[PDB]
DNA sequence: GAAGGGGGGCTATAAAAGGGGGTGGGGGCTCTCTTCCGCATCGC
């Protein structure tokens, strides 16, 4: 917890040229600044899917785990983060594939799903086998399809 | 929202009078006829009838 | 009371003398140039002020709809009826309820006091 | 919280509102300390003024005066229950004023028994005329404006604010500095009830009727209103041709604004009291007015006559537009109308311009009160 | 000039232990002259040596939306002090 | 043909429906939001410059068109949906558009090969939407369609849905920009001081502010005291004044004779002449402009190195940061210096007493800032920052050299949440910079009433801020009229900040004047780059939106040409200002937003163009097309601003004031539809509000914004956290032509009354109410108290979460003595069930790192019956409960009530129909107020209401208060009521209740509306008796509803020191606040360690433990002592 | 900060210790009552 | 010339080897009182 210093008012607080002599300082620990980094990555990722927000704590909670577990320190933060924000989507209930993961990030889905696999380890958690009926309502209603249709859709692939 | 049972200020009753009241002014009455045809006669039944605003049918429309 | 620019650089010219002909002449600061002095005043200062309002008005103000119009004060100079009259308004008279009369009348602005 | 209404001057609070605080003290100590230091009856004369802070009001100020008119008989039903309202009786019925050819109690007889002791207090109401102290009938009025209150009892005059009020020499004042707290306490509860309960027999309203006025005091007004429009349009006439010689210590402009000034607050005046003369006995306005509890002459004249000349900043109207104070005058129209002179009373209603002016003279008074609140208050806390 | 002094004769900035160095020489007699009994107030204490941490009642974390405790200002403050300090 | 006077008081009503029935109430709001979605969002995303990245491969961006599609909200599951107002409201959503640009990638690779890619509609963020604007869904909706959506039909709209919450934009009061204003400060050093706020079109970077000030001659000396008075120009990004005449040197004129020419337009004149000499003499040293740039550039914001980056510098300021509405480029020095010259040639003026000083109340002189401008002007920000970012994150990967992806540059949170932001918390600009943000731009709208919500949304604030106090900013200027309501604005802090829209008055929403600059150069106006200066003199300025565009020699044909074209709407849009100073040589002409104007009826040669065909179409709006448009089109109605006012010779009435008469004006050039136009939204349901005292008129006006009744038709479905519904409303029985236009009829905030103004019992004195018993019994002023419960379960943290359910008392960590027993399986009370003080409504239960308890108690005072349980995810996605408990409020002693003058006062007692007075025919009052409100107070307003009330009863028809109305009199009215067995004057014989005696005098009784206001004793009702302390101080809590103490302040303290009570001063100051014990050092006076427990006292510091005192102190003292110790003093208690 | 704490109408002084919140105190709309006496107040039960 | 088809690469799985490169983590608004400067005055 700290305090920013804030802008100069008077002469007093401007050295003899110009630029303020009170100037912030970063403090921030860089375990801290890089996983600030990673919250803001994933907040980014999730309003380019509108993602509610109770999804984005999931993911933050899950990046936080995995950072202080620190069994992916060697892959990039924000594979981890792509992969914890598409871990969060299945444990709520609502997946979203890798495919739409990547598009939202700058990660692969090959990096996503290599991150993916190693979350679920270093977590021991495990998520629930996806099925055709999870992305019937986000696919019908992307194409517009009426309600009739996208029962039928979900019924013909059950 | 609904007329009143009674006059407040006698207690006569006057929540059988607001459709007769609006069918009256229906038939070309003026609401000084309509009122006399009723037999509100005091002025503070008068203005039960005259100055009631029948919201209930406006909260009719919404659907329960 | 006169303002004069030099002719050279037009820029303003100062009052100075000669002490050899004692004669009053204007002077340029940056040009060195040098012109006969006509006027003789270097300059008036008015305390009062009594500046005649008849040139401060404008002829134009007869065209103003919300200023009063009176046909009791005809025009001295074409004897047109309507006239449109108002007070001066202006700031270091120190007192100001006269009357000053503009003719209506289009192409004679001409201007009064009762 | 139900309080008397007497409390309510000393608090400055009314009941369109107002919320007060309790406190409760905790032990025996700090109970006999507001006891015996704070308690309202002990509170009754301020070292302030060395007068009472709290008086009659309201609705028992004006029925205290209709009470003690010279002309109000009380039967013997009437009388009976009053006293049953008077804690202090001691339970003997006076020989009525008038035993025959029925036997009819006054209202100064049954207020003598209100009264507390034998107090000796003289006081004028307040319509009582200058001259009558000179005349003939000194000691006999004949308005019954002479009030004198004689071994504790009210032999003549109308009680009204200056005998009941919170004024120095007042009946109330004497029962203090006479009987003490205790007893004066009683004296102001006995006074509502006893009063009030006869208020229900004669009753007091106030009405469309008390706004109205003959149709020869409507002519005078307009008449008066009428003669100085011409006078504040000669007054401008002479400024306009230059023949307004200021006074000495003022400029024109100064000169012009007082004599314009002049006029038109004597117009208010003669309208005012030309209203006021039309005034029956029976006005409720005046009944108001004369008891002391609420309104004032001014009130009456605004209500009836004129509401006036509507100033800002002690100025007329100033010419907020272009030369005129509203798009709807000439330019420099220094007439009465224009600069916010209102010829209307509140009964005939304003014209819109009118309207308007009377609005931005009561913004005024608005923004005083913002002001007074904050600026008073920390005058208050650099003295204590 | 704001919270530093400088001492012009020529210009130095005038370090708050060079005060401490200079105040901690007058003596008590010299100290009561200016307006200062000793034992109550020596110039020296003026400078800021050892700061005073107030007592947590003096700056309580306020519980508000959840078991997450938002700090004083005055604790938020000491940690800037006790980062700069350290560093 | 021509509208006589006996049928002109219909055709001008027909004539102000038209106009509501088109425009409505809230066209400000929304025309303005309309403004910025439609066109400013478009061109600020134009006017940005194409972000170029060069790291080689060149990339180009540039964002063509902007789309906007409904407002949508985004399932968990990712499905969109169209957004209904109603469900934001209940789920706590936000009213927001989806935002799409359409942006072109260009790459040059230097191959000599470019490639162009267009990514089409790229999502960009959301904006919150107005409701029922444009681009709201309800917008183009029948009554019918918006009842199916759960919307009421008469709620305007003008509002924004902000995480549920109802916000309305004030419109917020400035000075206008461009516009050269002289001002003269006694104080200050300056005699006279010129300032012009200049701002860029389309208000790009933000006002830039220039001021010319003229030396005051407080200063003596030989050389001072004889050349006079000096002026200086105060330049943005300058320390210190600059001499005036060294600026028009940096601008390029040198010679004396051409900076003179641009300040003096006519050398004949020797006054004006004298008064810029010792100007000349001050800069007679710089005699270049490059000297001159340089003096400037010395000042400059920062220290310029060498020379040449001084004048640079100075260049820079003075092209564009100096008069940047004059213009930005750098060949505009030649205006510059006309404006600059026009600027000094004003303050010259002033000091030289020709020309008045401006007026800062003037409205001609301000401009209120709509939800469009302010919108704009946060979307100029956030987009800059899209695109900063754009270019940061772009930058790195064409670094690396990898191409970028354009969709995973855009940040769509920044244009979303910047926008929601500021609308959310009213904080206006940045959160970050919250410091210069200004604050209650936002505001949640009040749903009280129906009036009340309507007046929230033509609410106008000023600049002046509410701690400072300055009397004429509170002033009831006289340009106010027509614009303002006189009678509209809350008393406090805030009387004469706070302003409400007049009836009729319109604020422009702004135009481009590029049709009215090309007809003027088309039309004989000589440019200002093409003449002499020696021609301005006899020429007329020609000034568009605050700049100097040329000359006219021919001013008289030019106005009544551009007349003409705005009564046609040939080039000249309706709100466009033309002002021609007659005096001055001027031509005014304004096109921006901002600007307040009202419809005139316009007049010419003394006769209204509106004729007696106009009001015939009109009477037939419907089923012929024609609408208040066409009289706009017709050209016999016209918009006039302020300003333009100043101007216009206008009549009152057609009636009067045209007809020959006395010759007072015959020239007039508009007339009032109505004078009742000048009042607001509150002050037009006043009933006779020209018979009031004015500040009773103000009263009512606040008073009618807290009456009950029915806020809004379908507040059922709505859920607000309070809520008053009254039982049966009524409308007034004497109302007012604008309360037609107020919907006040379809949701009254009142009821009719028989009010009798007699003194029965006292029980009414000093502005108390004597309420029938009975009366209250039948539902008289009966009102419902809706209260709504919001509470979330959210999961956050490691293993922290938060669920609904019952909590056990051995399972939870944290309890209350209240009862949770009401609560169901789920944690939810249900809907039905009777809750008191003291219940546990949601049981929400918090895991402890077993679970503490967060459950949401009832307000203690509240006694009702839960209404609805809404359960729903809200914005976050998480479990989201809105319980709404309700309340029947039956009419108690102690509840406010007033009528429409002002008049407000608490019952007093309520009476059995019995015990109360009545007239021979039986009828009681149901409220009887003091005849002694009436004197000081001057409402006789109130009186013939009561009088016109009794009649209209009677006689069957709704009476008519309008306020300037000749054909209604008090005689008139009273010679109605005696034709109904009635004393002509409202009096009427009354028999005490008591007795059954007659009362000796007769009682004013009859009909008056009165209101029931939110203000309800049992909401006020608090009693203290040894509550909870604060954690600080360890004092008494704070409010009602924390069960808080009432303060007893240092004016209750120096009242008992006056009364001399110390032992009961003592109690209230220590004993009932905080009484606290500590330990003291007896050597040295600071507090020891006290160990009770052990019986061990110790002073650290002195190594003594035997010689402690125990000290009785309050806490506060303790934490003083503590708070002066952390500053090093050192507060020693010596008890010796 | 520790300045700003102490001064002021809400500061430490004037706010917590020339005045301050009390206990046994009571706060509700004022009524007439011309039965009560001077010196009476009617009190609520439930304030009582 | 659009569209379906065929072939082939990609994905993950383990494991070893050795080195380059990617990634992350340290480090060089008004009123009142006080202070400074210019001036004229004497003094020596
Ligand atoms: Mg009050
Ligand atoms: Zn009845
Ligand atoms: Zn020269
Ligand atoms: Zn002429
Ligand atoms: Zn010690």
């Known amino acids: 917890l700290s305090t920013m210093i804030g802008k100069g008012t008077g002469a007093a607080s401007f050295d003899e040229f110009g630029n303020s002599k009170y100037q912030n300082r970063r403090t921030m620990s860089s375990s801290d600044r890089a996983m600030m980094n990673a919250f803001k990555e994933i907040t980014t990722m999730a309003d380019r899917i509108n993602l509610p927000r109770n999804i984005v704590d999931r993911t933050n909670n899950l990046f936080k785990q995995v950072y202080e577990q620190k069994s992916l320190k060697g892959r990039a933060n924000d594979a981890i983060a792509s992969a914890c924000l598409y871990i969060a989507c299945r444990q709520e209930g609502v997946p979203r594939t890798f495919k739409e993961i990547c598009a939202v990030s700058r990660i692969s889905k090959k990096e996503i799903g290599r991150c993916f696999k190693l979350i679920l380890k270093a977590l021991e958690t495990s998520v629930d086998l996806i099925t055709t009926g999870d992305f019937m309502s986000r696919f019908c209603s992307n194409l517009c399809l009426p309600k009739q249709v996208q029962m039928a859709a979900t019924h013909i692939a059950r | 929202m609904i007329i009143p049972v009674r006059c407040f200020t006698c207690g006569k009753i006057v929540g059988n009078k607001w459709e007769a009241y609006l069918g009256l002014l229906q038939a070309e009455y003026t609401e000084g006829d309509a009122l006399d045809a009723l037999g509100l006669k005091r002025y503070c039944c008068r203005r039960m009838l005259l100055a009631h605003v029948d919201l209930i049918e406006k909260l009719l429309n919404y659907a329960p | 009371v006169g303002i004069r620019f030099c002719q050279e650089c037009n820029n303003m010219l100062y009052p100075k003398e000669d002490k050899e002909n004692r004669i009053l002449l204007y002077a340029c600061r940056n040009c060195d140039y040098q012109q006969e002095a006509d006027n003789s005043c270097i300059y008036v200062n008015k305390i009062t002020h009594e500046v005649d309002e008849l040139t401060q008005i404008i002829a134009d103000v007869s065209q103003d709809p919300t200023l009063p119009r009176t046909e009791d004060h005809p025009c001295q100079k074409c004897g047109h009826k309507e006239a449109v009259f108002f007070q001066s308004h202006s700031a270091r008279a120190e007192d100001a309820m006269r009357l000053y009369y503009v003719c209506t009348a289009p192409h004679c602005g001409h201007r009064w006091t009762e | 919280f139900r309080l008397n209404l007497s409390v309510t001057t000393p608090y400055n609070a009314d009941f369109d509102g107002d919320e007060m605080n309790l406190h409760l003290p905790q032990s025996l100590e700090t109970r006999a300390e507001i006891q015996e230091l704070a308690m309202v009856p002990r509170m009754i004369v301020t070292p302030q003024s060395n007068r009472p802070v709290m008086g009659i009001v309201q609705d028992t100020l004006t029925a205290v005066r209709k009470f003690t008119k010279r002309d109000v008989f009380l039967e013997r039903g009437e009388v009976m229950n009053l006293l049953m309202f008077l804690s202090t009786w001691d339970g003997k019925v006076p020989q009525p004023a008038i035993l025959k050819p029925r036997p009819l109690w006054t209202g100064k007889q049954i207020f003598s028994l209100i009264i507390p002791g034998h107090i000796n207090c003289i006081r004028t109401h307040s319509t009582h005329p200058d001259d009558e102290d000179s005349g003939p009938y000194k000691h006999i009025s004949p308005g019954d404006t002479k009030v004198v209150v004689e071994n504790g009892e009210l032999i003549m005059g109308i009680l009204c604010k200056k005998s009941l009020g919170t004024s120095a020499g007042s009946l109330v004042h004497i029962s203090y500095l006479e009987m003490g707290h205790d007893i004066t306490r009683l004296f102001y509860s006995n006074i509502q009830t006893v009063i009030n309960n006869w208020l ?185 | 000039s704001g919270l530093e002094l400088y001492a012009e004769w020529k210009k130095i900035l005038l370090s708050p232990e060079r005060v401490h160095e200079i105040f901690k020489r007058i003596s008590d007699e010299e100290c009561f002259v200016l307006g200062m009994e000793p034992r109550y107030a020596r110039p020296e204490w003026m400078i800021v040596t050892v700061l005073p941490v107030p007592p947590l009642s003096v700056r309580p974390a306020v519980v508000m939306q959840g078991s997450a405790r938002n700090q004083d200002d005055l604790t938020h403050k000491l940690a800037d002090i006790v980062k700069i300090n350290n560093q | 043909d021509e509208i006589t006077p006996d049928l002109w008081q219909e055709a001008c009503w027909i004539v102000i429906s038209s106009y509501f029935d088109e425009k409505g109430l809230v066209r400000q709001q929304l025309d303005s939001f309309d403004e910025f979605i439609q066109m400013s969002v478009q061109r600020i995303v134009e006017d940005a410059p194409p972000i170029d990245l060069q790291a080689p491969p060149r990339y180009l961006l540039k964002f063509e068109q902007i789309y906007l599609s409904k407002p949508t909200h985004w399932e968990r599951d990712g499905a969109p949906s ?69 919307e009421c039909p008469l709620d305007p709209g003008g509002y924004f849905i902000i995480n549920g919450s109802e916000k309305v934009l004030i419109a917020q009061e400035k000075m206008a920009t461009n516009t050269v204003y002289v001002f003269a400060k006694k104080d200050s050093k300056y005699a006279y ?17 220039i001021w010319v000030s003229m030396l005051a001659r407080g200063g003596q000396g030989a050389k001072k005291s004889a050349i006079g008075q000096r002026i200086v ?56 402009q490059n000297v001159a740039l340089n003096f400037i550039g010395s000042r400059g914001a920062k220290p310029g190195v060498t020379k040449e980056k001084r004048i640079k510098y100075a260049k820079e300021v003075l092209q564009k940061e100096m008069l940047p509405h004059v213009g930005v480029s750098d060949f505009c020095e030649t205006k ?98 919250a410091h210069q943000a200004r604050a209650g731009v936002s505001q949640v709208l ?138 001055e040589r001027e031509i005014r002409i304004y096109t921006d937003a901002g600007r307040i104007c009202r419809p005139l009826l316009i007049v010419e040669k003394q006769k ?30 016209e918009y006039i601003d302020t ?33 009742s136009m000048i009042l607001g939204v509150c002050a037009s349901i006043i009933p006779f509000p020209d018979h009031n005292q004015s500040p009773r008129n103000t009263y009512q006006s606040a008073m009618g914004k807290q009456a009950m009744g029915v806020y809004i038709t379908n507040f059922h479905v709505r859920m607000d956290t309070l809520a008053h519904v009254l039982y049966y409303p009524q409308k007034p029985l004497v109302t007012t032509r604008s309360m037609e236009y107020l919907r006040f009829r379809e949701l009254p905030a009142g009821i009719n009354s028989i009010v009798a103004i007699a003194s029965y019992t006292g029980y009414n004195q000093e502005d108390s109410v004597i309420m029938n018993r009975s009366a209250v019994d039948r539902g008289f002023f009966r009102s419902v108290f809706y209260r709504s419960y919001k509470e979330q379960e959210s999961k956050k943290g490691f293993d922290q979460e938060e669920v609904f359910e019952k909590p056990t008392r051995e399972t939870c960590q944290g309890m209350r003595h209240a009862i949770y027993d009401k609560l169901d399986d789920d944690g939810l009370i249900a809907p039905g069930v009777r809750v008191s003080g003291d219940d546990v409504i949601i049981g929400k239960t918090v895991t402890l790192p077993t679970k503490r308890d967060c459950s949401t108690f009832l307000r203690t005072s509240e006694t009702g019956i839960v209404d609805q349980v809404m359960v729903t995810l809200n914005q976050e996605g998480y479990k989201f409960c809105k319980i709404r408990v309700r309340s029947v409020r039956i009419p108690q002693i102690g509840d406010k009530f007033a009528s429409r003058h002002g008049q407000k006062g608490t019952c007093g007692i309520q009476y059995r129909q019995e015990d109360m007075p009545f007239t021979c025919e039986g009828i009681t009052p149901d409220i009887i107020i003091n005849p002694h409100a009436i004197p000081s107070r001057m409402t006789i307003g109130h009186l013939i209401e009561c009088l016109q009330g009794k009649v209209s009863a009677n006689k069957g028809e709704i009476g008519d208060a309008t306020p300037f109305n000749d054909a209604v009199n008090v005689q008139k009215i009273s010679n109605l009521l005696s034709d109904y067995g009635y004393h002509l004057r409202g009096n009427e014989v009354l028999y005490n209740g008591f007795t059954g005696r007659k009362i000796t005098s007769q009682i004013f009784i009859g009909p008056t509306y009165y209101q029931r206001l939110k203000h309800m004793v049992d909401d006020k009702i608090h009693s203290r008796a040894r509550g909870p302390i604060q954690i600080l101080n360890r004092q008494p809590m704070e409010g009602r509803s924390r069960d808080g103490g009432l303060r007893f302040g240092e004016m209750e303290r120096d009242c008992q020191i006056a009364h001399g009570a110390a032992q009961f001063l003592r109690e209230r100051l220590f004993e009932a606040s905080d009484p606290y014990q500590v330990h003291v050092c007896n050597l040295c006076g600071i507090m020891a360690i006290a160990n009770t427990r052990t019986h061990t006292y110790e002073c650290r510091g002195c190594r003594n433990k035997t010689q402690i005192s125990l000290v009785r102190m309050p806490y506060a003292c303790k934490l003083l002592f503590q708070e002066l110790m952390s500053m090093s003093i050192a507060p020693r208690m010596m008890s010796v | 900060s520790l300045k700003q704490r102490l001064k002021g109408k809400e500061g430490r002084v004037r706010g917590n210790l020339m005045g301050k919140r009390v206990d046994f105190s009571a706060r509700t709309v004022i009524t007439p009552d011309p039965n009560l006496s001077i010196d009476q107040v009617g009190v609520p039960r439930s304030i009582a």
């Not at chain 4, 311009?353 to 208050?377: N, Q």
């Not at chain 6, 010129?194 to 079109?201: A, F, K």
């Open chain 6, 446 to 583: 009040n749903r009280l009433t129906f009036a009340s919500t309507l007046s929230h949304l033509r609410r106008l604030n000023s600049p002046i801020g509410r701690d400072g106090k300055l009397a004429k900013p509170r002033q009831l200027h006289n340009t106010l009229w027509g614009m303002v309501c006189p009678a509209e604005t809350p008393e406090g802090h805030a009387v004469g900040l706070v302003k409400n829209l007049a009836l009729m008055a319109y604020i422009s929403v702004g135009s481009q004047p590029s049709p009215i600059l090309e007809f003027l150069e088309e039309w004989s106006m000589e440019n200002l780059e093409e003449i002499s200066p020696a021609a301005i003199a006899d020429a007329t300025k020609i000034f568009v939106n605050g700049c100097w565009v040329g000359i006219h020699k021919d001013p008289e044909q030019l106005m009544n040409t551009l007349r003409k074209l705005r009564r046609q709407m040939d080039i000249i849009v309706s709100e466009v200002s033309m002002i021609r100073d007659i005096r």
């Open chain 6, 233 to 288: 120009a105060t330049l943005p990004y300058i320390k210190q004044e600059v001499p005036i005449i060294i600026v028009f040197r940096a601008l390029g004129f040198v010679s004396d004779r051409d900076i003179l020419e641009h300040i003096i337009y006519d050398f004949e004149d020797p006054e004006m002449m004298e008064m810029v000499k010792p100007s000349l003499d001050e800069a007679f040293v710089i005699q270049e």
């Open chain 6, 82 to 150: 169209p957004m209904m107002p109603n469900e934001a409201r209940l789920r706590n959503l936000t009213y927001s558009a989806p935002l799409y640009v359409d942006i072109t990638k260009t790459v040059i690779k230097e191959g000599e090969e470019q490639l162009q890619t267009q990514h089409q509609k790229t999502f960009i963020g959301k904006i919150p939407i107005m409701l029922r604007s444009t681009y709201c869904l309800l917008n183009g909706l029948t009554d019918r369609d918006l009842c199916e959506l759960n």
């Open chain 6, 643 to 675: 300003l333009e006012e100043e101007t216009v010779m206008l009549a009152m009435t057609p009636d009067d004031l045209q007809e020959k008469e006395v010759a007072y004006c015959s020239t007039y050039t508009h007339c009032e539809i109505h004078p």
């Open chain 6, 336 to 433: 510059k210096a006309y404006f600059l010259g026009y600027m000094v040639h004003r303050l010259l003026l002033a000091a030289l007493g020709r020309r008045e000083l401006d007026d800062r109340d003037h409205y001609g002189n301000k401009r209120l800032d709509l939800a469009g401008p302010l919108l704009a002007f946060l979307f100029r920000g956030m987009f800059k920052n899209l695109l900063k970012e754009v270019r940061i994150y772009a930058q790195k990967f064409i670094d690396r050299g990898k191409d970028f992806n354009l969709e995973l540059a855009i940040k769509t949170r920044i244009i979303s949440d910047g926008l929601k932001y500021s609308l959310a918390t009213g904080n206006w600009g940045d959160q970050k910079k």
């Open chain 6, 193 to 209: 001081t010129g300032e012009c706020r200049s701002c860029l079109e389309n208000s790009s970077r933000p006002t830039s502010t």
């Open chain 4, 200 to 384: 229900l027999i004669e009753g007091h309203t106030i009405g469309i009727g008390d706004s109205i006025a003959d149709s020869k005091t409507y002519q005078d007004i307009q008449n008066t209103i009428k003669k100085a429009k011409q006078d504040v349009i000669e007054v401008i006439e002479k400024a306009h041709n230059n023949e307004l010689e200021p006074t000495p210590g003022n400029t024109l402009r100064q000169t012009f604004e007082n004599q314009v000034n002049r006029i038109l607050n004597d117009a208010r005046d003669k309208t005012g009291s030309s209203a006021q003369k039309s005034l029956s006995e029976y006005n409720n306005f005046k009944s108001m007015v004369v008891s002391g509890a609420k309104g004032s002459k001014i009130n009456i004249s605004q209500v009836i006559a004129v509401v006036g000349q509507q100033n800002v900043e002690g100025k007329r109207i100033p010419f907020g537009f272009k030369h005129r104070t509203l798009p709807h005058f000439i330019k420099d129209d220094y007439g009465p109308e224009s600069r916010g002179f209102v010829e209307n009373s509140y009964l005939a209603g304003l014209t819109p311009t009118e309207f308007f002016f009377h609005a931005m003279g009561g913004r005024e008074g608005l923004i005083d009160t913002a002001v007074k609140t904050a600026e008073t208050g920390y005058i208050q806390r650099r003295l204590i």
């Open chain 6, 608 to 637: 209204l163009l509106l004729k007696k065909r106009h009001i015939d179409q009109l009477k037939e709006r419907e089923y012929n097309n024609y609408s208040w448009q066409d009289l706009v089109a017709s050209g016999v109605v």
